[PDB]
Design a protein around this ligand. Structure first.
Ligand SMILES: O=P(O)(O)OC[C@H]1O[C@H](O)[C@H](O)[C@@H](O)[C@@H]1O
Ligand SMILES: O=P(O)(O)OC[C@H]1O[C@H](O)[C@H](O)[C@@H](O)[C@@H]1O
Lengths: 929, 929, 138
């Protein structure tokens, strides 16, 4: 009768339970159904094996008895390659289930009705403010008129830049995840028949299996990796955006604005790095970039195309204004179809349809030109027949729209037509615009080739002042720099060709050219010059990304110098965007010192832009508090230094967060919602400025933290051998892209790998190291600092948000895993070094607690804690499995007695098991640094 | 704050109210939203005008004060052509809303949990048996094994023949009706936000307006009228069928059968008359028929095509059996795309996809060949590239299916793949098969031309025995009958060409050749011969439709003679289908005598088929109790004479019932459900046979009823002038199709018109006339008959079902309208004739009540009564509007002072107002006779 | 409210304030007291409520009408309630309001009666209240 109630009972033990809190039930059902499936497919024997692992991991998660971990080891390590693959798949798959259940729980959790009004409320989905509440706060708590709010909003832009998953999932598998999540959602609805329940049951059972059996063993091209993206948009964002904008409309009613948000106001914009970012990544060629533009153009046209037919059916009206009636007549007159819904000709009896039919053909053509260009390279298709610019596509829709209003039918015009206008206006002809990123040294290499080939010396050898002097001269040069007959290395050709691609393609494909490892004025001019050389008609804006602390300290001088140049001031036309990267900067100096430095740098650069009349946009690269997703993003955005958003947000949406943020319609909606709300609020309601005591203490702690971080990571010569052993970092490095930009050392290692290696291991060093020294030293210098730190946590959003993130990571941390790793993988001489780090973990964690005023991690956030506690047993099993696998890979001569093979049925090795393991853990850990 | 609660309050008065009874709320909201819309578009002034009419009609529906009717008259008749058009649209549109609300109420009304077990329970959706209950009754109450039931079902076929709406709605407008119904459904769900409510509100408001403004003024071609159909299937049946068959699967689990209903068992089949039925309808040419086949073929291919892409995505599995792996390799090997989802090539890495891709191309081609044939007439596309036969399309799906099971994935195979198999198997390559119908006299005309041209005399002049002798001789003739140089009238050519079309097209397009006005053995042979002449490889089965009472009395002799002929016995191969038509036969002899005669005729023909070893299928034409839709259909089917279904049901689904039966997913499902359940039960659980006293009394009453009916309709010379005046019949006759097959008289008038004319008028003469004489005479001969009649109503399903239908009609009747009509449209000398008929109405109704043991109409069925009471005020307004319009049309010199024009805005005449009126009433009345 | 900030402001409002169990738990977990220490504190705690006379005070009859009215009202709002029970509760309500309205005679009263008032409220509520609460403590 009842496997489930028991599985529920044994799942409750992990987190004690309440009202709309279904998570444990959800997880229980999913798990119980999943076990049956393992039984059918692989046999009782294996099912038990899987349960045993779970029981052990769970028992471990409760008490934390290192014995349990070893028992688990004995089990996992005794499995042949075949069975371990299966277990690895199993746990890796129960995780994805646990995440769906959590998405669903988060989606339907009840909002708190009366909120404290504290800014802390904005760090949690249940208490944060929706758009209407935000408007109201601004109007009533801040004396802004509705008109002023409406106005702010009309001018606001929010750009979400999508990056590729650092490990990324299949469009099929997504949809199974959706179907499973829906079956589950549906099983919990009252007024549900025994039959429907029975049928939903088998539907659920079936869709889990279908997912489990979609598990083929692999690398994939940038093109496919990107063609991935065009899914999530279909799946959720494409529909999400109109839904949200309609909510904006409703919210404006309720504060007394009697009009809808203009359909062409560019409130929300999307962008991408996929096929764009070539930094330390030679797989991203010019041809790749040409292909992702054409794909983007294609698919977008296709989307507009597959829904136009539905709008056409809906638009059965015959009453129109004359403006339209003319243009319809024209179009019927000029007539004399590959697809089928409307495969016929259409009576001018129904004019809206005539227009939209033309639109459809044009969309189809636009689809086809991009398709042929993509596969052939030529296409015999006139610009006349096709949308080369979004205005061309809006125009007929605006026509219909106006016509409807004029005939007295605005109410109808504000239905699907409006949604469609909003989609077109948000997504344009290219769903995402592509950013280009390359590292400064590359532009230097190119310019050096040029200068040397010209016989004038070596750009590399020149001083900054010289580079600037030369660059400006040539920026007004009266004759080209570059011949066809210039000697080029493959890299230089690759780089130059990227500009040939930028010149050939329509500019509505592209966003910014980001310069990785920027450090100077010359770095930006260099890119400007090459754009001029290739006669790019609408050059992309150049965006320096300042990474290292020193580079951040130098940035203000660099920006000031830029803004001092008339050539440059006039090219940028009042607008500059600068990029920052929390992970990057924190790899240099620790997370703490990087956080603080970035606060100040933004402040200074804002001040500098203000002085020169420049609107400054700060592009948030990965690693922020602001890329967490969920409520915490809400507060993180409000926590930003004053005037740093100023109506224009641009942030990275880290791949490892795209599912949480967008994969479910409600979360999708609220993601969009908070980005828009927070951005709006901030420009009219900055956080308080830090008290000077706080700046002073923060400066003092930064030095100590950076000292500790660098002591351990760069100064200590034992560290890299430790890292290489205690961590799958090397094995990761036989992949996404070369994680060492072969030079050797941590400074050489890229940040994603850095973060990822220590996340696998549950130890998370890159995120907390240096916080402990900083805290300890500040308290030991003066016990009154504890009070100050606490006041800072209570009152200073930046600080709060900074500590919450590190707290969340400790909650996903477990030093026992780190300890097991030492014991299995690390040599006897390095173990005390490990012990030492674990000691620092603990001490850091405890200070962090003392400062937030919590006994236990996440007291402020039981729901998040519950989510984590539930995932853990699964992750733990993967950690352990991983650890022994790493052993067997590294040590050809480690062997133990293998249990006779357990899986039934009715070529793969350790490396395959390790990948499964790396991906399960990564998906269980989501974002950290 | 509250227009609604008042509108609710004033709607409650019409029907007193309870739990899940939302109908009045639903209607109230819809009406309140609709009024606002009238205000926006046409102005306060008009809105009030509309309310006034409603108030008056409602006041009338309560008390029945003829004053109210006149006040209403004064209002309606005082409106210029412009305003009356608007009112007519308005009320005509509030009706459609009231019907959606009722569909929704019916859909979600709660099933009664414990049922009496009486057969009466099967006449009502809340109490009738679903498939599982039916199985269980059969197993437990009737000692059938699960295996026997399963077996019966496996061999069962249910064919629903779709006829064209006798007035028919637009594919766009359908979907608006759906959207409105969904918005409404959604507004009533707890756990719903103020915002979502607000937004659903405007969504609702908007979609009503969009419908209201889709109202252009017209005739349309058979092709379009049919292209209509291909909507409803998309909309509901295409999805419905798999859903139901999966329920059959679940129902079989629960009685202990551990397998699913075979996916290729042809349980459910659909068919159509659209482009097929040319009886008294010369618009339905051979070319029309060729076009509807090609459309059918096309669209069906398109449907399979637009969903294949979704199955392909779902089928991400890589583990397959070898049988499949081969065929995949083959297909990838043979490679070297117009659409886009999979516009790429596909790795054999994923084999199921490779197959389904081929399938897709073949489906696309099949779509395109049918498209080109349709518009050009030639198409250069090989049979190899295309599905010419359903087996070809099943085969690859069965392949995938088997492969999945073999790899251990049956559970996955029983998801969408199964649904798809079931769809393919149910709908084949042509969604519907087309029946051909033509009247016997036409075949005679053709044969006569032939015989005369051959110099052998006149087939028309020959006796039946001679015709048979000649026909059989030529059925084995050794040389053709027909030259190219045969003299042909346009009709004869039309008829002969229909056979050229039948020969040229694939046989999976066609169903039966129905002979209207059949009367003899020769009538059927005639058609057989012409099929042989045109060398139709798979001749369609010939189905006589016996219409007049005499023709019914002669049918047994005719069938016996047929079955006696070896030529014929061997052609039909053990199977004969015979058609009957309740409306048709009841136009001849009254509804009562026709009902009874049809019971007996079926019994006799069954007996006769049994004796000759022939499986007999009875095709239920229109007019039955069995074409009512809803529960009543359930009991009607179970009420059939024993052995008349015998595993094969074929019934007409009258156009005026297709929306109720199919337009909403739940009703769609239950329609399919009861047809399948009842059919199954009947073969194993016939109704009781009538007691001989009952036969005897029924025979006695039949004579009297037929006498009365004929006395009034045919014998009385005043009748036709009455009909022509009291009834829009003439004006209807300036249309669907010629309603007089110019001959003159009622016997000449076709049945739909006959029924329809008196339905418009709310008087319904064709349905009840003769029941009163029959009842009165039987009781006056002997008061004990009342008891007998009542026992018959309690105990004899046929009788019950027969009386319920007439009762339902009286509930939709109102003699006051008939009376008003007399007063406005009928001359002074004919009014007493009207009075006399109204007197007969009343007396008939009262006997009918006394027999059912009811005080008031529909005591047995409050929900139905509530539905009717709510529609009425709207209908009443249309009746009145109609009546005066008919006056103004008929009397150029009737004029009254027109109110100054009331509608605002920001060429049409009386005829247009009358059409609006005819269609509102018709949609408010749904089915009657 | 189910999750409370933990701020002392929460204790100023019935929806957010701490019941006895939550108080015990705060003391045990946020303040390192053993259950035994809490139990012990409680065992020795005294709370004395001193009742003063209404500065303007109401009749024992009228109280009970107030109670009956408040119950009728409480009952009218319960699902699974019949048309009849609703109808009857309605007239019950209507009736008890009138009965209160018509209990309005014009008078001074002696300290004895003014106090004999009190002995009502205890009957009415505190006499039963105390055990209910102490059982909750348990
Ligand atoms: O961090 P990397 O290893 O350079 O990899 C890529 C990431 O780098 C930076 O930190 C950027 O700020 C992000 O927009 C990006 O996802
Ligand atoms: O009744 P008619 O005027 O011939 O029109 C068409 C109808 O006729 C018969 O009664 C048939 O039984 C039906 O399948 C059909 O809908």
């Amino acid at each position: 009768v009842e496997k489930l109630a028991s599985i529920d009972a044994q799942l409750r033990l992990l987190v004690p339970g309440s009202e709309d809190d279904k998570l444990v039930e959800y997880d229980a059902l999913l798990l119980d159904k999943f076990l049956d499936i393992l039984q059918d497919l692989h046999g009782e024997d294996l099912k038990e094996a899987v349960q045993q692992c779970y029981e052990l991991s769970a028992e471990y998660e409760g008490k934390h008895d290192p014995k349990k971990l070893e028992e688990l080891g004995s089990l996992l390590t005794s499995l042949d390659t075949g069975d371990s693959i299966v277990i690895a798949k199993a746990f890796s798959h129960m995780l994805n289930l646990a995440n769906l259940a959590e998405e669903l729980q988060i989606a339907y959790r009840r909002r708190i009705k009366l909120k404290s009004g504290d800014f802390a409320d904005e760090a949690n989905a249940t208490t944060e403010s929706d758009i209407e509440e935000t408007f109201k706060r601004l109007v009533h708590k801040l004396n802004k008129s509705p008109e002023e709010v409406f106005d702010a909003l009309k001018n606001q832009t929010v750009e979400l830049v999508l990056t590729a998953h650092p490990t990324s999932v299949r469009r099929s598998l997504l949809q199974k995840h959706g179907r499973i999540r829906n079956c589950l959602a549906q099983l919990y609805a009252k007024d549900i028949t025994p039959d429907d329940k029975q049928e939903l049951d088998e539907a659920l059972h079936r869709e889990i299996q279908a997912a489990f059996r979609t598990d083929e063993i692999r690398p994939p091209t940038p093109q496919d990796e990107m063609r991935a993206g065009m899914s999530y948009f279909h799946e959720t964002i494409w529909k999400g955006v109109p839904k949200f904008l309609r909510r904006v409309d409703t919210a404006l009613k309720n504060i007394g604005i009697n009009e809808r948000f203009p359909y062409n106001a560019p409130l929300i914009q999307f962008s991408s790095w996929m096929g764009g970012d070539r930094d330390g990544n030679p797989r991203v060629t010019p041809e790749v970039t040409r292909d992702v533009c054409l794909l983007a153009r294609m698919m977008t046209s296709n989307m507009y195309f597959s829904q136009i037919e539905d709008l056409m059916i809906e638009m059965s009206m015959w009453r129109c204004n004359s403006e339209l009636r003319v243009r319809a007549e024209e179009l019927y007159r000029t007539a004399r179809k590959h697809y089928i819904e409307f495969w016929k000709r259409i009576p001018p009896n129904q004019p809206y349809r005539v227009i939209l039919g033309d639109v459809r053909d044009k969309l189809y053509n636009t689809r086809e030109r991009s398709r042929h260009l993509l596969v052939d390279g030529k296409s015999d298709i006139p610009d006349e027949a096709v949308y080369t610019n979004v205005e061309q596509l809006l125009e007929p829709l605006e026509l219909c729209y106006r016509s409807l209003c004029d005939c007295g039918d605005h109410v109808i015009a504000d239905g699907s037509l409006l949604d469609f206008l909003r989609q077109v206006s948000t997504f344009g002809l290219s769903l995402v615009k592509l950013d280009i990123r390359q590292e400064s040294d590359r532009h230097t290499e190119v310019l050096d080739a040029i200068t040397q080939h010209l016989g004038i010396g070596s750009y590399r050898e020149w001083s900054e002042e010289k580079r600037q002097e030369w660059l400006l001269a040539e920026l007004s040069g009266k004759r080209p720099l570059i011949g066809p007959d210039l000697p080029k290395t493959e890299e230089v050709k690759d780089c130059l060709d990227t500009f040939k691609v930028l010149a050939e393609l329509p500019s509505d494909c592209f966003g910014a050219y980001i310069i990785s490892m920027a450090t100077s004025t010359s770095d930006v001019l260099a890119v400007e010059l090459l754009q001029r050389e290739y006669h790019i008609k609408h050059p992309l804006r150049v965006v320096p990304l300042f990474e290292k602390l020193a580079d951040l300290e130098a940035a203000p001088a660099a920006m000031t110098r830029l803004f001092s140049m008339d050539w440059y001031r006039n090219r940028i036309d009042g607008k500059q965007e600068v990029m920052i990267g929390y992970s990057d900067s924190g790899k240099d100096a620790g997370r703490f010192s990087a956080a603080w430095q970035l606060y100040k740098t933004q402040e200074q650069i804002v001040k500098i832009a203000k002085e020169f009349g420049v609107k400054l946009v700060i592009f948030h690269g990965r690693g922020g508090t602001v890329g967490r997703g969920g409520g915490p993003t809400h507060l993180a955005l409000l926590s930003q230094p004053p005037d740093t958003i100023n109506g224009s947000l641009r942030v990275t949406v880290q791949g490892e967060v795209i599912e949480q943020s967008f994969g479910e319609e409600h979360l999708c909606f609220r993601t969009l919602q908070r980005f828009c709300a927070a951005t709006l609020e901030h420009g009219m309601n900055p956080p308080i400025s830090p008290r000077p005591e706080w700046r002073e203490l923060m400066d003092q702690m930064a030095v100590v933290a950076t000292e500790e971080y660098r002591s351990v990571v760069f100064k200590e010569p034992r560290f890299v051998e430790y890292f290489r052993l205690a961590t799958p970092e090397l094995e990761f490095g036989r992949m996404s892209r070369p994680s060492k930009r072969p030079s050797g050392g941590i400074e050489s290692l890229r940040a994603i790998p850095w973060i990822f290696s220590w996340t696998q291991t549950r130890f998370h060093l890159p995120v907390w190291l240096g916080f402990g020294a900083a805290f300890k030293h500040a308290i030991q210098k003066d016990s009154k600092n504890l009070q100050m730190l606490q006041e800072m946590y209570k009152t200073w959003p930046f600080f709060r948000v900074t500590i919450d993130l590190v707290e969340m990571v400790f909650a996903k941390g477990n030093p026992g895993i780190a300890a097991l790793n030492d014991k299995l993988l690390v040599s006897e001489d390095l173990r005390p070094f490990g012990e030492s780090l674990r000691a620092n973990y603990e001490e850091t964690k405890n200070y962090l607690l003392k400062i937030a005023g919590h006994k236990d991690l996440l007291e402020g956030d039981p729901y998040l804690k519950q989510g984590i506690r539930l995932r853990d047993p699964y992750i733990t099993t993967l950690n352990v499995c991983q650890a022994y696998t790493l052993k067997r890979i590294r040590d050809p001569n480690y062997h133990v007695t293998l249990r006779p093979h357990i899986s039934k049925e009715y070529a793969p090795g350790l490396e395959d098991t390790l990948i499964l393991t790396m991906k399960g853990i990564a998906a269980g850990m989501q974002n950290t640094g």
